[PDB]
Coordinates of C-alpha atoms in Angstrom, one line a residue:
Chain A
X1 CA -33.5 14.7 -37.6
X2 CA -34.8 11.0 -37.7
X3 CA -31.7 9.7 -40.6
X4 CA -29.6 12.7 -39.2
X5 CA -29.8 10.9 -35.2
X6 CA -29.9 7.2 -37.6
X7 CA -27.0 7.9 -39.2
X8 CA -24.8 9.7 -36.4
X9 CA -26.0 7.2 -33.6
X10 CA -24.0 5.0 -35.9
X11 CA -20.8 7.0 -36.2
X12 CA -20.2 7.9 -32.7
X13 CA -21.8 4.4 -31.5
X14 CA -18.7 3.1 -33.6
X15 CA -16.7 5.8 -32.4
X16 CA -16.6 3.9 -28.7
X17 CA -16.9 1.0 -30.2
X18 CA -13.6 1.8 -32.1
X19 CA -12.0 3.2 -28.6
X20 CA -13.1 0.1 -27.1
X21 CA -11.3 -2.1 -29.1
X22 CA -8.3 0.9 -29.1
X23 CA -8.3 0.6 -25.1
X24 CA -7.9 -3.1 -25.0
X25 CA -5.5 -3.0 -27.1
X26 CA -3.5 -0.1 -25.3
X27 CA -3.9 -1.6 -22.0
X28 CA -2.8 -5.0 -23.5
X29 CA 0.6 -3.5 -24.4
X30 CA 1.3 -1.6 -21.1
X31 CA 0.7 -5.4 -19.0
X32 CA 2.8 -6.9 -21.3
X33 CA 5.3 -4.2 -21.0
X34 CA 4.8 -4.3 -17.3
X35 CA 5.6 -7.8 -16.5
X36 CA 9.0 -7.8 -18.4
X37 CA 9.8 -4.7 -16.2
X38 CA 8.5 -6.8 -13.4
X39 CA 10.9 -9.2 -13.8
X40 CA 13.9 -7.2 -15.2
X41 CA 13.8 -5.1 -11.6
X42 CA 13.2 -8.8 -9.9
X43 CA 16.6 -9.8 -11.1
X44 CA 18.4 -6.3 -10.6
X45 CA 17.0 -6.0 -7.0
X46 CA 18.0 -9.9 -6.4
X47 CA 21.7 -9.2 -7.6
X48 CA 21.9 -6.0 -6.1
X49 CA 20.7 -7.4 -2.6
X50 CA 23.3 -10.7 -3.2
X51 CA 26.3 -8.6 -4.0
X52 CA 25.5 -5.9 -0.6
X53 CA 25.2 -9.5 1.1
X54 CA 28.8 -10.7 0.5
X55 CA 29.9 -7.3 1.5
X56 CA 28.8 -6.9 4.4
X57 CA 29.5 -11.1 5.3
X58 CA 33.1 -10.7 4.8
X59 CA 32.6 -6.8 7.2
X60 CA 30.9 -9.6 9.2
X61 CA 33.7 -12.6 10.3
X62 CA 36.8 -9.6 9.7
X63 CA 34.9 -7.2 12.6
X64 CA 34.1 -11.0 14.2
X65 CA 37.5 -12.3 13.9
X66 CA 38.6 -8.9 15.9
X67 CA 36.1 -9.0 18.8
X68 CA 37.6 -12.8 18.9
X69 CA 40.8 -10.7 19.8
X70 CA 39.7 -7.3 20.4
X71 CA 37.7 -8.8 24.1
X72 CA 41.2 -10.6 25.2
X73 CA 43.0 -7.3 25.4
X74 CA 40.6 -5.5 27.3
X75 CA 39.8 -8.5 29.2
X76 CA 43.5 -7.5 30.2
Chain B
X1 CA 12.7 -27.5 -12.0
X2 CA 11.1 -26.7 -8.4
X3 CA 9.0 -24.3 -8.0
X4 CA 5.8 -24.7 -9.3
X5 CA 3.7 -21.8 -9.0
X6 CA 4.6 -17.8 -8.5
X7 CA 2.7 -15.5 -6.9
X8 CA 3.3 -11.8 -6.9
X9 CA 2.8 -9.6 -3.8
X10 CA 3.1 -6.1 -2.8
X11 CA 3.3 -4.5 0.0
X12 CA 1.9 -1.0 1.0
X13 CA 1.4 1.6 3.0
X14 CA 1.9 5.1 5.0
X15 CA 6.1 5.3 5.1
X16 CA 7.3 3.5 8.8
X17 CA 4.6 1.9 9.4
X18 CA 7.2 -1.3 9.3
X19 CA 6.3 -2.2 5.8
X20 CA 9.8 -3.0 5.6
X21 CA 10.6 -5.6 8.5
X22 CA 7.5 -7.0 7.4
X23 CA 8.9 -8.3 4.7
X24 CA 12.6 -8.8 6.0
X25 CA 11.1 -11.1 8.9
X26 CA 9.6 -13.2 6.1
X27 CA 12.3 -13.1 3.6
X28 CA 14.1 -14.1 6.5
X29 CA 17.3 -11.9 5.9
X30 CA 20.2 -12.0 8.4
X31 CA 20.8 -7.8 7.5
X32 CA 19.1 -4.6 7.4
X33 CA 20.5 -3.1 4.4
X34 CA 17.5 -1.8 2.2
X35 CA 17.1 0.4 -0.5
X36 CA 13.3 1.4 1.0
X37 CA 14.7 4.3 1.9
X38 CA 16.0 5.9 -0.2
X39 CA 15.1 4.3 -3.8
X40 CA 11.5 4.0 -2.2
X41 CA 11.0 0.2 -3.7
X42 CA 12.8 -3.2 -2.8
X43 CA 11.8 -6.8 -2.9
X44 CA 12.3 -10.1 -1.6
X45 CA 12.2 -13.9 -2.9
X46 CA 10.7 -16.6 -0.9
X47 CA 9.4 -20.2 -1.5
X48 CA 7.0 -21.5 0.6
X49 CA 5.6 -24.9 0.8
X50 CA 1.5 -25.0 1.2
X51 CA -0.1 -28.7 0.9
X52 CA 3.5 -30.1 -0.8
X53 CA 3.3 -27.4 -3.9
X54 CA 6.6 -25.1 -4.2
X55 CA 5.2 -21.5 -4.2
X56 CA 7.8 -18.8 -4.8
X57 CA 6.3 -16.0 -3.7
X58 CA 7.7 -12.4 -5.4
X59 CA 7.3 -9.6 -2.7
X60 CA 7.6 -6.2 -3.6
X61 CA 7.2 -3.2 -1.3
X62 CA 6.4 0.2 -2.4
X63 CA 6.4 3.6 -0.9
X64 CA 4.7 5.8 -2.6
X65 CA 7.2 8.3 -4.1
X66 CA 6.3 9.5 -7.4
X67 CA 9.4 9.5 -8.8
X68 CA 8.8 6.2 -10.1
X69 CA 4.9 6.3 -10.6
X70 CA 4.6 4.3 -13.8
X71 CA 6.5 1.5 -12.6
X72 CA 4.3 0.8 -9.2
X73 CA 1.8 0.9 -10.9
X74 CA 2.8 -1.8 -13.1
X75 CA 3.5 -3.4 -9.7
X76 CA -0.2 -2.8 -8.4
X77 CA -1.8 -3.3 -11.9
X78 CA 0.4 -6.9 -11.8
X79 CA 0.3 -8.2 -8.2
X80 CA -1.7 -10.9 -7.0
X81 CA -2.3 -10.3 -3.4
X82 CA -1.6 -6.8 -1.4
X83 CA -0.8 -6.3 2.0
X84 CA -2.5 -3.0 3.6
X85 CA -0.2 -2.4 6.3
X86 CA -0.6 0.4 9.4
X87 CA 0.7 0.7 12.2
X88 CA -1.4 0.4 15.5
X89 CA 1.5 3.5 17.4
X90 CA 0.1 5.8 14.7
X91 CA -4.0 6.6 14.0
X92 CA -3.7 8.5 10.2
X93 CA -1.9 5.1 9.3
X94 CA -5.0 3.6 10.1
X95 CA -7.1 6.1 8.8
X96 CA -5.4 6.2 5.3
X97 CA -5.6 2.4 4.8
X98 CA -9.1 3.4 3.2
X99 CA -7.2 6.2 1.1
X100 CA -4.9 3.1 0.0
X101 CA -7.7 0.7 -0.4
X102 CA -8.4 3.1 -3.0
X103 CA -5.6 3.3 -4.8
X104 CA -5.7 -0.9 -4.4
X105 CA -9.1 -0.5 -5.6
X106 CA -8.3 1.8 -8.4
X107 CA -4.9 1.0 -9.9
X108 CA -4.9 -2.4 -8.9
X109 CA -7.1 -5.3 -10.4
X110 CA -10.6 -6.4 -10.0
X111 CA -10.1 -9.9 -7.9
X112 CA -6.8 -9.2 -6.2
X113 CA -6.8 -10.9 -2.8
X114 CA -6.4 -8.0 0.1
X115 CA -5.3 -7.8 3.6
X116 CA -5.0 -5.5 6.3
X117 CA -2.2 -6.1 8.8
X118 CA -2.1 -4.1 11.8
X119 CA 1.6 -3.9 12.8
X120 CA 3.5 -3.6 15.7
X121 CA 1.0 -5.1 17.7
X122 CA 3.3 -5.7 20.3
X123 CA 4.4 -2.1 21.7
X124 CA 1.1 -1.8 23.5
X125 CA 2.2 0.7 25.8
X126 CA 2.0 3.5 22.7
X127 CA -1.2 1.7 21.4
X128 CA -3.4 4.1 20.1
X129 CA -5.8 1.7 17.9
X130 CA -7.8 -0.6 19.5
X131 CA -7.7 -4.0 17.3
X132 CA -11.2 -4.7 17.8
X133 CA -11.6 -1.0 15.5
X134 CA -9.4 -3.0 13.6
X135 CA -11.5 -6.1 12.8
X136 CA -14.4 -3.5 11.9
X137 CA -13.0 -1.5 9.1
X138 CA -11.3 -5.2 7.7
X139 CA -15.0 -6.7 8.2
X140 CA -16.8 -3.4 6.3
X141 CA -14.5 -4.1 3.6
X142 CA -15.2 -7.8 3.8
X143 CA -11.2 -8.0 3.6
X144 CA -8.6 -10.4 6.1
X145 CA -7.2 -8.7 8.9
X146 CA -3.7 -9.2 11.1
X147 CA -2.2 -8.0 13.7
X148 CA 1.8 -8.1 13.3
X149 CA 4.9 -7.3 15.1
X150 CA 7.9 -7.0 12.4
X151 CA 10.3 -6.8 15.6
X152 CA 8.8 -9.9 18.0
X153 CA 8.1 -11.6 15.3
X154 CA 4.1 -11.8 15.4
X155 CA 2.1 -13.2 12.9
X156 CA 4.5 -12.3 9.7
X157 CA 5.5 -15.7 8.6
X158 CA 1.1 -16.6 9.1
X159 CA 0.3 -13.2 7.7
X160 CA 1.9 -14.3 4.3
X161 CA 1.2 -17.9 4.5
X162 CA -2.3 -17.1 5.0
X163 CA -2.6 -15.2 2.1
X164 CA -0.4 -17.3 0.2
X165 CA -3.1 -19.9 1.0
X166 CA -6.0 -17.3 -0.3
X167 CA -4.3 -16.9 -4.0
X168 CA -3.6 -20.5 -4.4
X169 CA -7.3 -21.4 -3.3
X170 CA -8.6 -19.0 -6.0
X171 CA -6.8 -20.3 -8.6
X172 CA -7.0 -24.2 -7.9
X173 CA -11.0 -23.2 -8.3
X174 CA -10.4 -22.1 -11.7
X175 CA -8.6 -25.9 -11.5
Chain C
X1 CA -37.9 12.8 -23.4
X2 CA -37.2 16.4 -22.8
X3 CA -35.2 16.0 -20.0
X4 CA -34.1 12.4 -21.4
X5 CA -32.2 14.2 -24.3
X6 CA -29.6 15.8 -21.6
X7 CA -29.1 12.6 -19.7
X8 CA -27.3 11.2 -22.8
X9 CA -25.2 13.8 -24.8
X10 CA -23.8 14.3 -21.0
X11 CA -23.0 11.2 -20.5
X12 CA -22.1 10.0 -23.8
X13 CA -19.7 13.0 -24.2
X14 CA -18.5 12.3 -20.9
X15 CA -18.3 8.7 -22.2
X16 CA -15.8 9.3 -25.7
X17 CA -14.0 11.9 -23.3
X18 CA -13.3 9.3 -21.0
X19 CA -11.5 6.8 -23.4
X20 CA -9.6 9.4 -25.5
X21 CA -8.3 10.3 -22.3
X22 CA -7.7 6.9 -21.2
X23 CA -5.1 6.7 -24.5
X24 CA -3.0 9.8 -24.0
X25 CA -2.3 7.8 -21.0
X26 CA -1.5 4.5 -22.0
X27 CA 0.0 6.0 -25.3
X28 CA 2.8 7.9 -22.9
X29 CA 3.3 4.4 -21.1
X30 CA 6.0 2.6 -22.7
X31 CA 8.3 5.5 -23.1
X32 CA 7.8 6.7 -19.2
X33 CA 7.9 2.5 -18.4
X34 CA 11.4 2.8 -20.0
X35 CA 12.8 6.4 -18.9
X36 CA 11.8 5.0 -15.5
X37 CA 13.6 1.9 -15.4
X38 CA 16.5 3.6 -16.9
X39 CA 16.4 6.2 -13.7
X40 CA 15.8 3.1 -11.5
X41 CA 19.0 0.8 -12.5
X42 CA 21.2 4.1 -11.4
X43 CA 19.7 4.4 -8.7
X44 CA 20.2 0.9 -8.3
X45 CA 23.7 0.6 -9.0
X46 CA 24.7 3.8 -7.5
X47 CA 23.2 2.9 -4.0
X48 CA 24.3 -0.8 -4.5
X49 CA 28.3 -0.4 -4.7
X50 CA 28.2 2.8 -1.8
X51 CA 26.8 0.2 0.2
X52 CA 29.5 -2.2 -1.0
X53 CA 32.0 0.6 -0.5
X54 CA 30.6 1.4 3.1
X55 CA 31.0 -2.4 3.8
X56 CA 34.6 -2.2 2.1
X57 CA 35.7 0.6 4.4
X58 CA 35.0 -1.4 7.5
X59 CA 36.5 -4.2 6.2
X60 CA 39.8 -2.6 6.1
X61 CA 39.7 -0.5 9.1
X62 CA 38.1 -3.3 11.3
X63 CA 41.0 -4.9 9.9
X64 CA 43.5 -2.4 10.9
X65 CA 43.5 -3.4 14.5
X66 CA 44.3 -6.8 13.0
X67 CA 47.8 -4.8 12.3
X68 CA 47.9 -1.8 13.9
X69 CA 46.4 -3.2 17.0
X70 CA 48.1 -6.4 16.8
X71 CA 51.2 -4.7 17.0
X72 CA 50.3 -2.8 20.1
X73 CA 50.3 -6.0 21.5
X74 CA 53.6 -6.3 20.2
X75 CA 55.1 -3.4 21.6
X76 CA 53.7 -3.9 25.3

């Protein structure tokens, strides 16, 4: 088995070879895919924060507004 | 315009460990609202200046669950420095930053910049890990090492400015 | 040479093994990547307006004793 370990040596040193190039390739797509995921949540999570924000700024000076008021009465 | 570089950061960790007001210290919000809880991710926006540069700085903070596996991992896999967070109240925090280091190690990349922040640093009274245990498993790792309080307000804003400094000085090398 | 013939073939099959497993993986990627953030952006939306709504409630209420408790001071 001297042109049978030749020959196959060949094959299956191709056959990594072949994966190697196949895994670069695979984990090349999954980054790429990543970072656009990356920065679709950024904006989502951003938005979703800056709407919760005005929310809870108006619950903020309303509830303020009252303890402007609310203190006065119980101060008497 | 403005900014004019963007680093991404994660932080991690073992779940209340303060991983959170880590972040919303820095961030510098005025609330408490998250959606750690119960999503199990949120992240914050903050530009920095560092030697007259804008650096925006993209923090994300992840929790583990594996509901969303594939996506935090595309956090790890693209995140440029990673804060290793535990907190000194609790030991298997501390014991499982190595457990994390792997995972930082393993689904992160090969020249990530790393730090361990010891946090609450300031409720001595229930202190359980000594910092100077601390410095030694940073040291072994030959990783940065902090000691943090979310809640006095210790070392957070130096914490990320420090690494923040680490990222930039890796890439200017690669000018 | 005798024992140097099993220190390849099990490591080499552990070698092809390893990428071909690596693919399955990274083949599933985009589709989970997806299915994901799909999950996420509910999860997302739904917990963004109940905290609006949460914020909302309080607004109103808080802003009841603006009525309600304004015309308590009326009435005394």
């Amino acid at each position: 088995g001297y042109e049978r370990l030749k020959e196959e040596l060949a094959k299956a040193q191709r056959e990594l070879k072949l994966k190697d190039e196949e895994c670069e390739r695979l984990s090349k797509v999954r980054d790429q895919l990543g970072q656009e995921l990356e920065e679709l949540t950024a904006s989502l999570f951003e938005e979703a924060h800056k709407m919760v924000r005005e929310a809870n700024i108006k619950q903020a000076t309303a509830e303020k507004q009252l303890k402007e008021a609310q203190g006065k009465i119980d101060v008497l | 315009k403005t900014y004019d570089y963007l680093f991404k950061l994660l932080l991690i960790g073992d779940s209340g460990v303060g991983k959170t007001c880590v972040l919303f210290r820095f961030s510098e919000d005025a609330f408490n609202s998250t959606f750690i809880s119960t999503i199990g991710i949120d992240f914050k926006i903050r530009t920095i200046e560092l030697d007259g540069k804008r650096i925006k700085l993209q923090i994300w903070d992840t929790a583990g669950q594996e509901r969303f596996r594939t996506i935090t991992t595309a956090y790890y896999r693209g995140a440029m420095g990673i804060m290793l967070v535990y907190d000194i109240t609790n030991e298997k925090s501390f014991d499982n930053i190595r457990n994390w280091i792997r995972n930082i190690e393993e689904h992160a990349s090969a020249d990530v910049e790393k730090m361990i922040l010891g946090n609450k640093c300031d409720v001595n009274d229930k202190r359980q890990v000594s910092k100077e245990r601390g410095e030694k498993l940073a040291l072994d790792y030959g990783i940065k090492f902090m000691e943090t309080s979310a809640k006095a307000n210790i070392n957070v804003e130096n914490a990320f400015f420090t690494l923040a400094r680490d990222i930039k000085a890796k890439m200017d090398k690669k000018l």
